[PDB]
Design a protein around this ligand. Structure first.
Ligand SMILES: *C/C=C1/C(=C/c2[nH]c(/C=C3[NH+]=C(/C=C4\NC(=O)C(C=C)=C4C)C(C)=C\3CCC(=O)O)c(CCC(=O)O)c2C)NC(=O)[C@H]1C
Length: 319
């Protein structure tokens, strides 16, 4: 049961320290990571309500010009499909995805979800060869299925994720009932220090983070030195309140966790929740030595793999 959050910084809330970090409102940072752009829109009208300040870089026009325009006008070939895909009251983890063309090389990937009456739209560049087929997941299921026991399953799962991603380090991090954790499997680049078998305090993944990760199963930091980009306006006009960004991979990472990653020499981080019978069982935790943007289709493959692994774990634990 997490503590109530304090207000975010931009609402005059306290600075976050090691004494109060379980109260950081990590779901409402009012900012995004700079490798993409984000807009929010009214769920009925499609009016664009908030835009990240870097929106021009990705969309080819200025935030001051795009705000107030409707998605019906801006995205005529996707707006109807988006609407149909994310009806009022759908789960906030449900996503609509489309690939758009843009002046630059490759394409823009569009990912949308719905929170309350708001649509949250993420745009990130993707290269054409950065497609991953359903084969990646399909062929991977084979070695997961043949694993004879839980620890073998964990070992194959980390190796498979490393093969799919090329990450320098992939761990299966399992939580204990006291919320401490243990690295129970690890696939890593030759020469990297092993974390295998190491245990970590509960505070390293605080309670509000673990709660969030129970609902929104994938998060990342593409560049652990990159400054966040504000949303403008920072509050949702629908509510005059902060915008929930837990469902957006572009959400700005807690600065506290960014420092933790830099202290470990990590350039890029990504993890996927393993949720068993609705409780957070563990994470597939990935590091890269340098900044790296795992493509959207591969992220989705990894989420799917976490769900598959959840079930395989749940099968084996019953035995
Ligand atoms: C006082 C606050 C603290 C801080 C908070 C914090 N931690 C996270 C998220 C993560 N922490 C992780 C921990 C590990 N990564 C590892 O490699 C290992 C061991 C080898 C551990 C124990 C992980 C995996 C995450 C998840 C995100 C990720 O995969 O990179 C958050 C939430 C970040 C966010 O989603 O915005 C917060 C606020 N950790 C502390 O140590 C204290 C200082």
């Amino acid at each position: 049961d997490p503590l109530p959050f304090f207000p975010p910084l931009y609402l005059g809330g306290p600075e976050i320290t090691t004494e109060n970090c379980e109260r950081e409102p990590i779901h409402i940072p009012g900012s995004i990571q700079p490798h993409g752009a984000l807009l929010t829109a009214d769920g009925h009208s499609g009016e664009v309500l908030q835009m990240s300040l870097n929106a021009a870089t990705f969309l080819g026009q200025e935030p001051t010009v795009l705000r107030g325009q409707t998605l019906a006008a801006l995205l005529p070939e996707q707006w109807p499909a988006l609407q149909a895909a994310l009806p009022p009251g759908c789960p906030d983890a449900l996503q609509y995805r489309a690939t758009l063309d843009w002046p630059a090389a490759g394409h823009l990937s569009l990912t949308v979800h719905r929170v309350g009456e708001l649509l949250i739209l993420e745009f990130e560049p993707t290269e054409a060869w950065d497609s991953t087929g359903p084969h990646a997941l399909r062929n991977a299921m084979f070695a997961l299925e043949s694993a004879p026991n839980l620890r073998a399953l964990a070992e194959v799962a980390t190796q498979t994720v490393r093969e799919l991603t090329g990450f320098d380090r992939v761990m299966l991090y399992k939580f204990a009932p006291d919320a401490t954790g243990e690295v129970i499997a690890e696939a890593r680049r030759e020469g990297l220090h092993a974390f295998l078998g190491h245990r970590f305090p509960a505070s390293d993944i605080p309670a509000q983070a673990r709660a969030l990760y129970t609902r929104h199963l994938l998060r990342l930091t593409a560049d652990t030195r990159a400054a966040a980009v504000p949303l403008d306006p920072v509050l949702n006009p629908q509510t005059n309140a902060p915008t929930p960004l837990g469902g957006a991979v572009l959400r700005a990472t807690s600065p506290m966790h960014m420092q933790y990653l830099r202290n470990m020499g990590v350039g890029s981080s990504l993890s996927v929740s393993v949720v068993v019978g609705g409780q957070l069982w563990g994470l597939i935790a990935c590091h890269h030595q340098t900044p790296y943007v795992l493509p959207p289709d591969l992220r989705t493959t990894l989420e799917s793999l976490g769900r598959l692994l959840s079930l395989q774990v749940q099968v084996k634990e019953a035995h």
